[PDB]
């Protein structure tokens with residue numbers, strides 16, 4: 001007490017606390033309401049969150065991310081073997097369990113996924129402590145609805161290692177529905193669709209709620225579709241533009257690509273509220289400045305197939321839940337990527353004009369609902 005709600009996200013984490021009948025989403029030391037699920041190791045220190053993501057480009061083999069993709073899994077799991085090929089850090093096998101291997105202070109170290117996630121949770125715990133001016137111990141932590149018992153157990157363990165008393169592990173879509181008060185009893189069942197597009201995954205969940213009890217009717221999605229893919233499309237676009245203007249290809253310069261990606265992600269966010277965004281990077285490659293811009297229309301065209309494709313999982317989830325689109329009582333947007341206007345248009349159009357629940361920052365809705373539930377369990 002106070003107990004907190006924590007969304008331990010694949011790419012960003014968020015912590016909230018319910019007090020005086022209101023949820024407060026807590027800003028970190030940099031004033032950010034969400035924090036990168038990154039941890040880095042150097043010759044002298046361990047960095048977590050914003051501090052870790054800010055040096056990823058210069059320290060690729062020792063900056064860990066995506067621990068959520070390893071948590072609770074066996075080393076021989078096809079998913080792990082597939083994902084490992086794409087990470088710049090090493091994943092080793094310890095008696096059948098995956099561990100990330102890094103260098104810290106000149107020595108080789110290895111950590112279980114739950115230890116890496118415990119570092120992220122320690123950061124979220126401290127963020128809440130700085131805001132509350134009191135020690136934080138009890139917490140509700142969320143996980144994807146498809147997580148199995150081992151993945152739920154390892155997530156709870158990450159919390160315990162961080163010094164938290166995990167009151168309960170609840171599903172992300174359920175937490176999002178709770179944020180909007182859809183758990184309240186209205187004397188009849190209600191069907192709710194959660195459309196969750198984050199930084200690296202896309203989850204569609206259909207919930208049936210009655211008497212405060214949740215039932216996951218169906219889930220669909222793509223574990224390799226998120227905001228990072230839209231950033232990739234923009235990066236490729238600008239590498240091509242720089243090549244045309246300067247007859248130089250920056251593709252093989254890791255730092256150049258990173259600075260460009262960062263500017264693209266920032267420009268993308270601006271495009272959700274404005275129709276154009278400027279990209280200005282000083283000395284991007286060989287001392288050449290890269291000052292350009294991108295319109296919302298071009299950003300939408302660069303990603304047209306990926307945006308439209310989000311509707312397939314929606315149709316499949318409806319089919320698996322044995323529900324027609326007209327039987328959905330509420331549609332809830334979750335994940336930072338749902339702030340993109342074109343995605344909202346596509347989903348609303350698919351639902352024949354039905355309004356979307358989007359008043360709660362989508363990238364905060366999971367933590368918001370977790371905080372409400374944590375207070376209820378406290």
Ligand SMILES: Nc1ncnc2c1ncn2[C@@H]1O[C@H](COP(=O)(O)OP(=O)(O)OP(=O)(O)O)[C@@H](O)[C@H]1O
Pocket residue numbers: 009010011012013034197198199200201202226227228265268269270272334335336337338339340362363364
């Ligand atoms: N205003 C915005 N417009 C567009 N995209 C945005 C905006 N704000 C944030 N994003 C994107 O949202 C993503 C992060 O979403 P969120 O914080 O919900 O991630 P997450 O739940 O950790 O993701 P994952 O699905 O990988 O678990 C990033 O790709 C970020 O660029």
Ligand SMILES: [Cl-]
Pocket residue numbers: 028029030049050127
């Ligand atoms: Cl911080």
Ligand SMILES: [Cl-]
Pocket residue numbers: 345346
């Ligand atoms: Cl459209």
Ligand SMILES: [K+]
Pocket residue numbers: 007008009010011012013014198363
């Ligand atoms: K998140």
Ligand SMILES: [K+]
Pocket residue numbers: 196197198201202203335
């Ligand atoms: K997601």
Ligand SMILES: [Mg+2]
Pocket residue numbers: 009010196198335366
């Ligand atoms: Mg998420």
